[PDB]
Amino acid sequence: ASPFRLASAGEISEVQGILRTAGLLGPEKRIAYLGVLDPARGAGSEAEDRRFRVFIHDVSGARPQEVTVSVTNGTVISAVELDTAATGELPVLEEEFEVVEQLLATDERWLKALAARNLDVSKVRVAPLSAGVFEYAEERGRRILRGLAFVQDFPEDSAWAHPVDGLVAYVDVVSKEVTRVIDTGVFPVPAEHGNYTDPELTGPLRTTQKPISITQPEGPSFTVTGGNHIEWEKWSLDVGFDVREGVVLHNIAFRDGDRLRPIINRASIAEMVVPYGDPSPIRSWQNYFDTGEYLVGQYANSLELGCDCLGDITYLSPVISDAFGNPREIRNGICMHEEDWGILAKHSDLWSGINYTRRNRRMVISFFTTIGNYDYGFYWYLYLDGTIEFEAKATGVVFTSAFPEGGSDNISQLAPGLGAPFHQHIFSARLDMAIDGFTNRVEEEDVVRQTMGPGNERGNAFSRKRTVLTRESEAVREADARTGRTWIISNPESKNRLNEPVGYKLHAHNQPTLLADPGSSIARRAAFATKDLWVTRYADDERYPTGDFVNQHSGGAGLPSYIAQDRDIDGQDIVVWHTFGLTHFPRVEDWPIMPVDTVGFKLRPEGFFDRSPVLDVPAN
Amino acid sequence: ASPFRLASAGEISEVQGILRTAGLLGPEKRIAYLGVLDPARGAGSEAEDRRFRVFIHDVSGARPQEVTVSVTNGTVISAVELDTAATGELPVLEEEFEVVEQLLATDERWLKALAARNLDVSKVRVAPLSAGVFEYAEERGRRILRGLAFVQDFPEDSAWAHPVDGLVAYVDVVSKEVTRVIDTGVFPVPAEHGNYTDPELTGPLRTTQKPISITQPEGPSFTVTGGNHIEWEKWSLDVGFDVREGVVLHNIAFRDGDRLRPIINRASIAEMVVPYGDPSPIRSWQNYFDTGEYLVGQYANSLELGCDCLGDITYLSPVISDAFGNPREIRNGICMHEEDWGILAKHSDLWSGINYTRRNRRMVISFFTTIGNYDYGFYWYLYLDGTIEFEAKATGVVFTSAFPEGGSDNISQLAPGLGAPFHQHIFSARLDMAIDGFTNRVEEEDVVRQTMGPGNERGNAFSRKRTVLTRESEAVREADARTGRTWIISNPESKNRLNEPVGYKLHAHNQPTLLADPGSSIARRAAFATKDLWVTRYADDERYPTGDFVNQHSGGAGLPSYIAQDRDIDGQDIVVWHTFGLTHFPRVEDWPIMPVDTVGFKLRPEGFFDRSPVLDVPAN
Ligand SMILES: [Cu+2]
Ligand SMILES: [Cu+2]
Ligand code: NA
Ligand code: NA
Incomplete structure (x- = not known):
């Protein structure tokens, strides 16, 4: 009966159902964050109200939402559209990890950089790295990842042994565009394996x-x-x-x-x-x-x-x-x-x-x-x-x-x-x-x-x-x-x-x-x-x-x-x-x-x- | 065969025998410290020379000695009389732990202090505490312990629960004299047991x-x-x-x-x-x-x-x-x-x-x-x-x-x-x-x-x-x-x-x-x-x-x-x-x-x- 129990599979499915019923979880929506909220202060006297907080991303470019749901009562407590340029972008999604490498693989600037270093694009892994906030005005309001490259010689190889220095790319993971590719010059890619x-x-x-x-x-x-x-x-x-x-x-x-x-x-x-x-x-x-x-x-x-x-x-x-x-x-x-x-x-x-x-x-x-x-x-x-x-x-x-x-x-x-x-x-x-x-x-x-x-x-x-x-x-x-x-x-x-x-x-x-x-x-x-x-x-x-x-x-x-x-x-x-x-x-x-x-x-x-x-x- | 092996019972007995044979360990002598010495630098080439360092105290008031013995060769390497007022007193001997309480038990100043606090002398333990070096000129060259008192209500009692504050004594453990008893006033002896x-x-x-x-x-x-x-x-x-x-x-x-x-x-x-x-x-x-x-x-x-x-x-x-x-x-x-x-x-x-x-x-x-x-x-x-x-x-x-x-x-x-x-x-x-x-x-x-x-x-x-x-x-x-x-x-x-x-x-x-x-x-x-x-x-x-x-x-x-x-x-x-x-x-x-x-x-x-x-x- 504890209000501090772990979330059950049933509760998460129910939050999903409540969001769906409310029009908040259509096919272009993705859950970036979902968690149970703690009971409020002095709420031990009252009956249980299990509430969940959700950050919902939209892959079609629409604004994300912060939502609070009562799984107990089957209701949406609150739902607010976020202005990410002001309050922040949602957490990085796992499905975005692969996107940086995928986009860069057909970008002519990236391919030119790899060619200068005699690297096979099929063997170049790209780390999906958080972007932070620097001098690039075009990034404000956009979901950006930055990519640093590592060569993987074969499927079981540790790519970390082979960093590709002097090269970085910036990618908009929603519009699926490469915004920038910076190549400051070739460095030798270290050759020793780290397996x-x-x-x-x-x-x-x-x-x-x-x-x-x-x-x-x-x-x-x-x-x-x-x-x-x-x-x-x-x-x-x-x-x-x-x-x-x-x-x-x-x-x-x-x-x-x-x-x-x-x-x-x-x-x-x-x-x-x-x-x-x-x-x-x-x-x-x-x-x-x-x-x-x-x-x-x-x-x-x-x-x-x-x-x-x-x-x-x-x-x-x-x-x-x-x-x-x-x-x-x-x-x-x-x-x-x-x-x-x-x-x-x-x-x-x-x-x-x-x-x-x-x-x-x-x-x-x-x-x-x-x-x-x-x-x-x-x-x-x-x-x-x-x-x-x-x-x-x-x-x-x-x-x-x-x-x-x-x-x-x-x-x-x-x-x-x-x-x-x-x-x-x-x-x-x-x-x-x-x-x-x-x-x-x-x-x-x-x-x-x-x-x-x-x-x-x-x-x-x-x-x-x-x-x-x-x-x-x-x-x-x-x-x-x-x-x-x-x-x-x-x-x-x-x-x-x-x-x-x-x-x-x-x-x-x-x-x-x-x-x-x-x-x-x-x-x-x-x-x-x-x-x-x-x-x-x-x-x-x-x-x-x-x-x-x-x-x-x-x-x-x-x-x-x-x-x-x-x-x-x-x-x-x-x-x-x-x-x-x-x-x-x-x-x-x-x-x-x-x-x-x-x-x-x-x-x-x-x-x-x-x-x-x-x-x-x-x-x- | 290692020159870093632990001392054996045989080696200690042999140091005893060597000291005895050399006239350094008569009946008034006590070993305050005995230890094996490490091999000298670059001595791995030469054959083993197990040497022992000894500090010898004399209970009759004679000066102590620092001695080095070769247990391997059966010889005294060096033996020097110490001037303790200059170079320091030897380490406290275990046999001296009991002496502070023993001497104080028949000292009229100590007994007066205990009587003022209604404490039975038979129940007063005295910690044998190192003296250090302070303002007391008479202590220079003398083996002194200081005594702080704790009441032990019965044999299995933890005396630490019952400190006797406001009282300290100084004792010369060789001449077996109480040099000073300082009583700055009674404090309540804490009564709760700590058993x-x-x-x-x-x-x-x-x-x-x-x-x-x-x-x-x-x-x-x-x-x-x-x-x-x-x-x-x-x-x-x-x-x-x-x-x-x-x-x-x-x-x-x-x-x-x-x-x-x-x-x-x-x-x-x-x-x-x-x-x-x-x-x-x-x-x-x-x-x-x-x-x-x-x-x-x-x-x-x-x-x-x-x-x-x-x-x-x-x-x-x-x-x-x-x-x-x-x-x-x-x-x-x-x-x-x-x-x-x-x-x-x-x-x-x-x-x-x-x-x-x-x-x-x-x-x-x-x-x-x-x-x-x-x-x-x-x-x-x-x-x-x-x-x-x-x-x-x-x-x-x-x-x-x-x-x-x-x-x-x-x-x-x-x-x-x-x-x-x-x-x-x-x-x-x-x-x-x-x-x-x-x-x-x-x-x-x-x-x-x-x-x-x-x-x-x-x-x-x-x-x-x-x-x-x-x-x-x-x-x-x-x-x-x-x-x-x-x-x-x-x-x-x-x-x-x-x-x-x-x-x-x-x-x-x-x-x-x-x-x-x-x-x-x-x-x-x-x-x-x-x-x-x-x-x-x-x-x-x-x-x-x-x-x-x-x-x-x-x-x-x-x-x-x-x-x-x-x-x-x-x-x-x-x-x-x-x-x-x-x-x-x-x-x-x-x-x-x-x-x-x-x-x-x-x-x-x-x-x-x-x-x-x-x-x-x-x-x-
Ligand atoms: Cu680290
Ligand atoms: Cu401590
Ligand atoms: Na608090
Ligand atoms: Na050294």
Whole structure:
């Protein structure tokens, strides 16, 4: 009966039927985005109203629509025509991926460029790359993809080994026209293959790895009810899935004695951007919003047992809409398991003679997605001791270019003639906070050093300070690792037994934020990425740090627009947006396929509990 | 036959016999430190000379000696009387732990203080705490411990719940005198118990945890030969153990094709300090050098199977000397196992149709030690992809005090009337580098932001810069998280296939360094802890960042003295010393026993290999 249950195939089919009946889903219409909406605030009292949000594209050139449907009542709640030049283009459609290569294949400028390089058009793959917003006035209001070319020598070849540098094309994917072909000159196409399953490159496979078997002979310690409600070691939550955000966690709460205590109302990765740092005109426009432009959830992998996820795994198989509104299942798209996590607590006491050891565990909820060359794993962890953690795992194949003769300040060499432009992968976690309920505030906590003198004669004292963020205008914060800066979310109306407000402390990794010049297109479009932490007052339409329509959308929406409202956030329903990312100067070791690298953040209880919450964990 | 084998019981007994025969180990002598020395540089050509270093204390008040013995040849190599007032007191002896309480029990000032607080002397435990160097001239040249008191209500009671604040004593443990008793006034002794095995506090133990079974049905993938030589998934190393440093890794190398390539010659935690930040005179002198003053290795726990270490574990049982030179085995004191580590690399390629997934693993070498209230785990990890990582796990019981009425800027409240003074746990990892051999250099690498303008018209470019550290005077470096600062150790004479020097990149956690005022005693004694990274030219007598004798030893030795030599470190035999630590403002959740918290660092290959080193890892 949960209003947070996953969308069923039946609900998606019903949205399709409702849209059809209403005249909104004729033969030229395509669903670019479809997702369930969360229940409104205080709606637990009322009966269920399952609502779905839909972005509908029109392949005949007509304007797209944003539509909200009540699947419960069989009605269209709202439907509005979008002016994309103003508010943004809809997300890239999967069916458009192939169109760039297809159109370019009969374009005389493209063919001339390929001929200059002695490349067979039949062997030239073209990546369908988001366009962003630059100096090309004709693109405003048009659905444009840009194309970069890679040679594929045979069907099983890794085309990433063979970038065609000095060449880029721009394509209007609706009118099916090539708007521009830019050829700045030939570069050698790197010749070495990158086929990581070819025995010639791998050499003889290791025979040294003996098996590791992870089993749970009594099954797992968590239960799943209502399709997606998890209960595990005092934790309770609902595992949602959205085609844009991927796995979304709802109603994270911890059962402390008798009382179910909320911690986080909703946790998601609300955006992720991959800005490239190569000033070549062939690539200087490249910034991929995997979440906002491409919808990462939709490309979630089916995860194979004992391979992607090891141990006793329980899977969810989320259902999404295809381009026509038919349900499609992502089989085994979400892994859920618990795993051992080393020592939890240990003390061997001389005076009492008592030796004590307890083991830790974490609940793991994950998925893995692929967009082009990139593959990302998104992992949420809940620990016995109350810690909540997110980790992103980045792998795949590095996006390549030529490596310039005589080197580059903005590109790494991976193989002879083969380059990897510098880039970042930057995430925004949106944490709709509910520390013991919705009345929350955030404080920035810094370590405070003290001077040797009166009151500190030996010069050993140190302290800390906390600054409450009272209004949104003062809640745009940067990291300070040197001073141990963290942020505490607390509930000023809920005190622990020591009469202190209950709280959770956010620990960041303090990685560099967005490096681009502040006057760049990307600094405006990914404004969120320029600062480590933002706090907003909750609003049901403030979902993404980049706004609803990111594709070919200038600044104007998202977090900078939300915080201009300068709302009170001191003991209110608030949302924390944490920016965190990797800055990648590719190494030779990343080629021809990249070993996982990670980034993340965690939140630990900070006087939330009245003592350790893991005193009741048993021995052995 | 390895010259890096663990010390055997026979060798320790033989050192005892050699010392006895030489007149150096009569009945008033005690061994404060005994360890094997590493072979000298280029000594692989010559026959084995196993040498042992010994610090010998004399309980009758005579001066201690530093002695080097050749167990191979049955000789004393050198023996020198120490002037402790100058060079430092020997490490605290285990037999001295009990002496502080024992002496204080019949001291009329101590008894008067306890009587004022209505405390039974029979129930008052006294912690034997290192003294440091402050304003007390009479302590110079004397072995002093300071005593802080805790009430133990019954034999199995956790005395840490009941600190006796306002009271401290100083004791000369050789002459067996109480030098000073300071009573600044009564504080309430906190009354609540902290007995984490008492059902009244734990409540009913959870019955919800189902078993997790980790087995290896064909045994582990690593081999152990010569007692302590490990071979695992291309890695080779020797696992040493020293009573001061604990687990020491030697000869870390990676077999790349045919060639065994050195990476790190020796890795250890060469010091660890716990400075306290409470300006009360009762505690303002508290700084515990667990490694240098107490010798952490000697208190290594015996680790129980399926409990401290889970899975298919191979143990080492290192042998150490007792106070009289007899061998004593630390049974199951070192755990060795491999464990699964999630996804190593993954890509699902649209164009080629090939889907590829490989699992990661790490080799784990660990031990756990206990000193008083503190328990620390030291973990070294080697990963398939060439990454080397260290992690410290801090747990135990927090060191307590009274919590002052009306609060404190330097102390946390844990329970009614119960305080936890702020402190840090700061480690020094000494990495005797050997990237493809001994000719190494270090560069500091920062991200470089670029301005929008000519050559960067879209304001997207970013870069990096590397600064070679050429001499020791310029090799004292601080973190800069905001600019993504790392340090690369490379070999300028060994290039990869792309003609770039092979290297490894050190990634720090960028936690705060030593917070104490720069004019404090602790800032001078733990100078290493004030900066994140030091690089020295290798010398066989430069072992610890705090010098050989840390106990009651002022500034004058250690890293600041080593780098004054201003030696060339640009393509030379060099040593990196990385400071890293935790800054602990104790939380209510840390009481009555602390959940593990962690800190560490890692090194990743940076063009060391000619491509990914894990292409030959098999499927599933
Ligand atoms: Cu990357
Ligand atoms: Cu601590
Ligand atoms: Na909220
Ligand atoms: Na070295």
